[PDB]
RNA sequence: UGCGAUAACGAACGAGACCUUAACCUACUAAAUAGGGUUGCUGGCACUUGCCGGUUGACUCUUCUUAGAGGGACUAUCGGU
């Protein structure tokens, strides 16, 4: 049962939060970085932490994760959100014709506004569920 | 620290454990072996032109 | 005796390789290594296993004495 | 670009770890001494027969950790490695023996650089220091350069007639490349260009140009004799190594994806080098950590993570 | 033990970490209270130069020895699941 302990995991997470850059995939370097950074009394523990960090990095390299979304990750997300692949056109314009609204909908429109583009559907209630 | 105490009725057994703080221990390690305190990182400004500064 | 023999064998295996590394082509050494791997009865790799401590409550390490609740 | 299209000819396999550095001798062309993560250091010699472009001549078993950066002397009889066990080892390449074990660093020795006269060694470590050694085993000058790790230190060759001072540049994880001089025995200029962290600072065969690269994925070239700013390339992924060739104003650069190749002044991002691997999934594909051009400007050597020295060669289209 | 799902959030003890020992070090520091190499004298051989020895006679070494300081494994790299 090589389940890396909770404390270790936490430490790794913290490290990731702090220093996402200066954590290059490979292991020895990572370990060294960890040593430089945090005050691990043990050696074995430190090694474990390093390993965990490496694993996390690897995971990241195949897309993001839960509990690991610190700064750089946010920026990456954020940019995408800002400049979405969509939208060409409006979108959600009156691209094809002038809105296939229902009879009821049309009535509502009439009640409310004056002159709108409409295409009045038949409203088939339809049999069965 | 264990210490028996003789009284009229019988004996009372006193035991005392005092967990000294790691910082004021001096001999041996100054911190617990499981605790991993991570130092806070330091900020830097990227780019600001290629530039040089000669002597 | 057997253990001693094994040790001797291991030493022999090492020695030639070492010599090759030192004073002969590396290719030869590599070949030797490959050969050893192919017929690996340890030889270059030192054997990992040392005996277990015979902890109390038992005549061997893992083995215990003999309970009875009769 | 014009004519040459580089072709993978040979593949050298004598290691069991990352081939973290290679170095052809300045005088002698046939040699290629390759340093690795698996503690060994292997001297290859160019045969030029079938797939076996080179075959191993001598292994230098004498370190308790990684062998990071190797240098060959000008003549090509001695070589100095820089290991992760806080030392360097001056070898006798032809003999198959050590000579000088350099003690002093309090951190894994990342880079080494010998003078063109094969006299004054200088080395940098994960120690916030660069130490200067002789061809014996003795610490002369000690440079308190940076506040973070010093990743690379490489001496620039000079021709225009004898000032006295020899010049090198020290890459770091402080985001500062820093040039030096050694007979003022001190600083030349700070090249504060990088955004992320630097891995490599490679001076060219010319000497006046110095390509710096790292995690940023942007290769900043620097003018050294003029002591001024110059070009800045974008290379997408993290750069592990750089290499100038004598043949042209080529800048080879080992990215995380593969090996990109540019022309220096006429900035065009020309060729990419990527060999094949068995199986694998997505964003892993064994990358070139180090690489080295020969003295001809013909045979490109590439140290990979997959324990192979991959050998590319010039081949004209027409 | 974690990952997850979650009127629960972050914690402590216990487990883990820890310690001792068992494993690796032709990389360091060391030794006639640990072991070898050359050589002196010297025993026997074949009798060419070579083979085994015995002597704390010299000189030098640290691989095995010990045992100090360190590294070294983190499930590492790759494949699936
Ligand atoms: Mg896997």
PDB file of N, CA and C in Angstrom, chain C residues 17 20-27 29-30 33, chain D residues 13-14 55-61 95-97:
ATOM      1  N   UNK C  17      35.176  -8.147 -16.142  1.00  0.00           N
ATOM      2  CA  UNK C  17      34.442  -6.955 -16.571  1.00  0.00           C
ATOM      3  C   UNK C  17      35.232  -5.700 -16.215  1.00  0.00           C
ATOM      4  N   UNK C  20      38.249  -5.272 -18.350  1.00  0.00           N
ATOM      5  CA  UNK C  20      37.823  -4.811 -19.664  1.00  0.00           C
ATOM      6  C   UNK C  20      37.593  -3.299 -19.648  1.00  0.00           C
ATOM      7  N   UNK C  21      36.910  -2.855 -18.599  1.00  0.00           N
ATOM      8  CA  UNK C  21      36.598  -1.443 -18.394  1.00  0.00           C
ATOM      9  C   UNK C  21      37.885  -0.622 -18.337  1.00  0.00           C
ATOM     10  N   UNK C  22      38.833  -1.144 -17.565  1.00  0.00           N
ATOM     11  CA  UNK C  22      40.126  -0.506 -17.376  1.00  0.00           C
ATOM     12  C   UNK C  22      40.950  -0.391 -18.665  1.00  0.00           C
ATOM     13  N   UNK C  23      41.296  -1.548 -19.228  1.00  0.00           N
ATOM     14  CA  UNK C  23      42.448  -1.674 -20.143  1.00  0.00           C
ATOM     15  C   UNK C  23      42.134  -2.189 -21.552  1.00  0.00           C
ATOM     16  N   UNK C  24      40.862  -2.459 -21.831  1.00  0.00           N
ATOM     17  CA  UNK C  24      40.431  -3.086 -23.084  1.00  0.00           C
ATOM     18  C   UNK C  24      39.287  -2.230 -23.649  1.00  0.00           C
ATOM     19  N   UNK C  25      38.865  -2.530 -24.876  1.00  0.00           N
ATOM     20  CA  UNK C  25      37.672  -1.921 -25.478  1.00  0.00           C
ATOM     21  C   UNK C  25      36.418  -2.039 -24.602  1.00  0.00           C
ATOM     22  N   UNK C  26      35.567  -1.022 -24.693  1.00  0.00           N
ATOM     23  CA  UNK C  26      34.300  -0.972 -23.976  1.00  0.00           C
ATOM     24  C   UNK C  26      33.243  -1.895 -24.570  1.00  0.00           C
ATOM     25  N   UNK C  27      33.330  -2.095 -25.886  1.00  0.00           N
ATOM     26  CA  UNK C  27      32.412  -2.941 -26.634  1.00  0.00           C
ATOM     27  C   UNK C  27      32.407  -4.351 -26.054  1.00  0.00           C
ATOM     28  N   UNK C  29      33.344  -5.308 -23.101  1.00  0.00           N
ATOM     29  CA  UNK C  29      32.772  -5.235 -21.757  1.00  0.00           C
ATOM     30  C   UNK C  29      31.247  -5.308 -21.832  1.00  0.00           C
ATOM     31  N   UNK C  30      30.706  -4.515 -22.752  1.00  0.00           N
ATOM     32  CA  UNK C  30      29.267  -4.433 -22.983  1.00  0.00           C
ATOM     33  C   UNK C  30      28.713  -5.811 -23.344  1.00  0.00           C
ATOM     34  N   UNK C  33      28.643  -8.103 -20.416  1.00  0.00           N
ATOM     35  CA  UNK C  33      27.523  -7.707 -19.563  1.00  0.00           C
ATOM     36  C   UNK C  33      26.222  -8.319 -20.085  1.00  0.00           C
TER      37      UNK C  33
ATOM     38  N   UNK D  13      24.449   4.054 -28.264  1.00  0.00           N
ATOM     39  CA  UNK D  13      23.769   3.536 -27.075  1.00  0.00           C
ATOM     40  C   UNK D  13      24.747   2.802 -26.152  1.00  0.00           C
ATOM     41  N   UNK D  14      25.393   3.571 -25.277  1.00  0.00           N
ATOM     42  CA  UNK D  14      26.230   3.036 -24.195  1.00  0.00           C
ATOM     43  C   UNK D  14      25.868   3.521 -22.796  1.00  0.00           C
ATOM     44  N   UNK D  55      31.675   4.541 -31.754  1.00  0.00           N
ATOM     45  CA  UNK D  55      31.611   3.406 -30.819  1.00  0.00           C
ATOM     46  C   UNK D  55      32.460   3.712 -29.579  1.00  0.00           C
ATOM     47  N   UNK D  56      32.081   3.157 -28.407  1.00  0.00           N
ATOM     48  CA  UNK D  56      32.668   3.628 -27.152  1.00  0.00           C
ATOM     49  C   UNK D  56      34.103   3.146 -26.928  1.00  0.00           C
ATOM     50  N   UNK D  57      34.974   4.069 -26.519  1.00  0.00           N
ATOM     51  CA  UNK D  57      36.405   3.801 -26.329  1.00  0.00           C
ATOM     52  C   UNK D  57      36.780   3.638 -24.855  1.00  0.00           C
ATOM     53  N   UNK D  58      36.227   4.487 -23.985  1.00  0.00           N
ATOM     54  CA  UNK D  58      36.572   4.466 -22.560  1.00  0.00           C
ATOM     55  C   UNK D  58      35.479   5.095 -21.693  1.00  0.00           C
ATOM     56  N   UNK D  59      35.124   4.398 -20.612  1.00  0.00           N
ATOM     57  CA  UNK D  59      34.148   4.870 -19.635  1.00  0.00           C
ATOM     58  C   UNK D  59      34.900   5.320 -18.392  1.00  0.00           C
ATOM     59  N   UNK D  60      34.438   6.411 -17.785  1.00  0.00           N
ATOM     60  CA  UNK D  60      35.126   7.033 -16.651  1.00  0.00           C
ATOM     61  C   UNK D  60      34.267   6.942 -15.391  1.00  0.00           C
ATOM     62  N   UNK D  61      34.232   5.738 -14.826  1.00  0.00           N
ATOM     63  CA  UNK D  61      33.508   5.468 -13.586  1.00  0.00           C
ATOM     64  C   UNK D  61      34.242   6.100 -12.408  1.00  0.00           C
ATOM     65  N   UNK D  95      44.143   7.658 -21.371  1.00  0.00           N
ATOM     66  CA  UNK D  95      44.622   6.689 -20.376  1.00  0.00           C
ATOM     67  C   UNK D  95      43.498   5.822 -19.799  1.00  0.00           C
ATOM     68  N   UNK D  96      42.386   6.458 -19.434  1.00  0.00           N
ATOM     69  CA  UNK D  96      41.300   5.800 -18.704  1.00  0.00           C
ATOM     70  C   UNK D  96      41.535   5.896 -17.211  1.00  0.00           C
ATOM     71  N   UNK D  97      41.802   7.117 -16.752  1.00  0.00           N
ATOM     72  CA  UNK D  97      42.142   7.399 -15.356  1.00  0.00           C
ATOM     73  C   UNK D  97      41.778   8.830 -14.973  1.00  0.00           C
TER      74      UNK D  97
END
